[PDB]
Structure 1
Amino acid sequence: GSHSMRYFYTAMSRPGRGEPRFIAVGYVDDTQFVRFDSDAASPRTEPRAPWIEQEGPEYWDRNTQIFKTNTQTYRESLRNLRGYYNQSEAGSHIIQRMYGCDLGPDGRLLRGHDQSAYDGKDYIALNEDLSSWTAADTAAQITQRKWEAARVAEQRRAYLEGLCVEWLRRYLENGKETLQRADPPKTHVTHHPVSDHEATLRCWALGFYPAEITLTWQRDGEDQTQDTELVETRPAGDRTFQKWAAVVVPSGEEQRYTCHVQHEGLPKPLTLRWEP
């Protein structure tokens, strides 16, 4: 199917507690594969998935050089943004960056991304054309001018259409037994009375990968969007994910309710009901 690579950078200032922390993690789809943390006893790029371990010394050294350099440039950038917003030196602030490439089911580039935020708000993003920028405010317009002057977009475009896709393809092949395996959800419906007159039906999906899934309840074949309690999809810790959806129904009316499950790993979409 479709696949993506992303790097996520977080740079956090902490006045009075040393220099800003820089952390980078890399993902293919829902699988992390590398980390770097400037706070580590010996900051270096470390593998986080077995299929990346086969990369040579030059790969690790090159990654580490890049993240060490970013640690320094992001510290300068934090200073710069503090100034752009006329902020005092007393507060802690965060720059986040997420970038990478998306491939379609044929393996060709679907689109690229290079997005930044400041204190959790959109700051600047590379447009889908990979040639122009969208700045959130007049501070970000200053970054935009700097990046335009330095032809940054042209360099991101080269990476996103080139190395990004090339490496993602390599990782997909090297990790094909996991990265290209969809594990379908194991499902069941539970029943718990909440009173004499109502009961909870909870539809469970466990052990699935990737995280993308759709869980809905219908009553008489009609979507119950407003009445359904849906927890956020959550990691199990073994690569797989979990989710449930719950509905409170009148006792006696249980068979009017159906749980529907869509997941990439499913030969056919599931329809489930409570089985007393």
Structure 2
Amino acid sequence: DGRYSLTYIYTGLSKHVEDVPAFQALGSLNDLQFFRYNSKDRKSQPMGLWRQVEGMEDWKQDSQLQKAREDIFMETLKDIVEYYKDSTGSHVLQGRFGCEIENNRSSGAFWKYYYDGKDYIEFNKEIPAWVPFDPAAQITKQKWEAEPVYVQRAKAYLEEECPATLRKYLKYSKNILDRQDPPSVVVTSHQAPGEKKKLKCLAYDFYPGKIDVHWTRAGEVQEPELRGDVLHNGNGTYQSWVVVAVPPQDTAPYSCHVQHSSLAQPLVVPWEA
């Protein structure tokens, strides 16, 4: 087994402009986002390849869960703006929490909130208690610790419940996170009216994203003019290209070389003028 992480990020706005939900929530497994929720449609929705995964989460219910998280999230934001006597301004509260395992061994945990970009409050499951970094965080901590049970629950979420969810989610996400999809390539050349000729070598439809794409000119690894790449969450595939400029009076043979963890040995693709 290898590394796997579960992360959730909450964003709440005290005074939201039109067409922007006051509260957004999202979740990513490793390098891919699998769900999303906002205060407009108020419905948890799977994403990417998880749109086709059946029986991993009863989203209809999770929507009710989110609606609960949301009400506590904005209230917290309400109290902060309240404290600072400035409800006329536009403020923001970001929270981040999740956990990670490695070799089926819980190896991480985090739960931190940010206010207007500054560190606000974060939980330390070792004490266990919340650490306040902002004067108003002091009240929040007070409220979130009014009963001896509260900090026991939080520790319980990071050390027991969250990793439980990661493991569950992992049983249904094998055919996704563990993929090793080989990269397909296409070497194309475009000539602009005036400049030199340019050769584009694209590597598409692959996963993981760590790839090695480069050109050569008669065996000599050439320096790229343009380099780029992207992630398409819908498919859960990466794309990575490279471009080189070729002198007007050159005949030498250009070959694109692609390396990957999915490939047994590197691929080569020459450009036939």
Q: TM-score normalised to the size of structure 2?
A: 0.71
Letter in 1 for 2:78: R
Moved more, 163-172 or 246-255: 246-255
Cα distance in 2, alignment partners of residues 266 and 67 from structure 1: 41
Q: Which residue of 2 aligns with 1:75?
A: 74
Q: Could you give the per-residue CA deviations for residues 31-64 of structure 1, whole angstroms, max 9, x where no partner exists? A: 4433332211xx343444256541576x853x33
Residues 1:248 and 2:245 aligned together? yes
Cα distance in 1, alignment partners of residues 110 and 256 from structure 2: 35
Shift in alpha-carbon separation, 1:103–1:15, aligned structure 2, 3 A: closer
Cα distance in 2, alignment partners of residues 123 and 254 from structure 1: 59
Q: Which residue of 2 aligns with 1:66?
A: 65
Q: Could you give the per-residue CA deviations for residues 45-95 of structure 1, whole angstroms, max 9, x where no partner exists? A: 3444256541576x853x3343222212221232344467x5843443332
Letter in 2 for 1:123: D
Please report how far the alpha carbon of residue 7 of structure 1 lies from its aligned counterpart in structure 2 after TM superposition: 1.5
Q: Which residue of 2 aligns with 1:39?
A: 40
Please report how far the alpha carbon of residue 255 of structure 1 lies from its aligned counterpart in structure 2 after TM superposition: 5.6
Equivalences, count: 264
Cα distance in 2, alignment partners of residues 257 and 156 from structure 1: 58
Please report how far the alpha carbon of residue 180 of structure 1 lies from its aligned counterpart in structure 2 after TM superposition: 2.3
Alignment of 1:1-276 (within 5 A): 1-14=2-15, 21-40=22-41, 43-48=42-47, 49-50=50-51, 53-55=54-56, 60-61=60-61, 63-82=62-81, 88-104=86-102, 106-119=103-116, 121=117, 123-124=119-120, 131=126, 140=134, 142-143=136-137, 146-147=140-141, 150=145, 156-194=154-192, 198-215=196-213, 224=223, 228-235=225-232, 237-251=234-248, 261-270=258-267, 274-276=271-273
Cα distance in 2, alignment partners of residues 200 and 10 from structure 1: 43
Cα distance in 2, alignment partners of residues 31 and 208 from structure 1: 14
Match of 1:39, SS?
Answer: coil
Shift in alpha-carbon separation, 1:258–1:20, aligned structure 2, 3 A: same
Letter in 1 for 2:119: Y
Letter in 1 for 2:25: A
> Which of these two proteins has the greater Rg computed from alpha carbons?
2
Structure 1 gaps of 5+ residues are none
Match of 1:54, SS?
Answer: coil
Cα distance in 1, alignment partners of residues 130 and 198 from structure 2: 46
Does structure 2 conserve the Cα–Cα contact (< 8 Å) formed by 1:116 and 1:123? yes
Cα distance in 2, alignment partners of residues 262 and 80 from structure 1: 53
Letter in 2 for 1:98: R
Letter in 1 for 2:91: H
Cα distance in 2, alignment partners of residues 141 and 162 from structure 1: 30
Shift in alpha-carbon separation, 1:20–1:249, aligned structure 2, 3 A: same
Cα distance in 2, alignment partners of residues 254 and 74 from structure 1: 64
Please report how far the alpha carbon of residue 170 of structure 1 lies from its aligned counterpart in structure 2 after TM superposition: 1.9
Q: TM-score normalised to the size of structure 1?
A: 0.70
Please report how far the alpha carbon of residue 163 of structure 1 lies from its aligned counterpart in structure 2 after TM superposition: 2.3
Q: Could you give the per-residue CA deviations for residues 212-261 of structure 1, whole angstroms, max 9, x where no partner exists? A: 4454567775684xx54333413173332323232334346686876554
Moved more, 251-260 or 200-209: 251-260
Shift in alpha-carbon separation, 1:144–1:107, aligned structure 2, 3 A: farther
Cα distance in 1, alignment partners of residues 154 and 222 from structure 2: 43
Cα distance in 2, alignment partners of residues 210 and 50 from structure 1: 19
Cα distance in 2, alignment partners of residues 189 and 245 from structure 1: 10
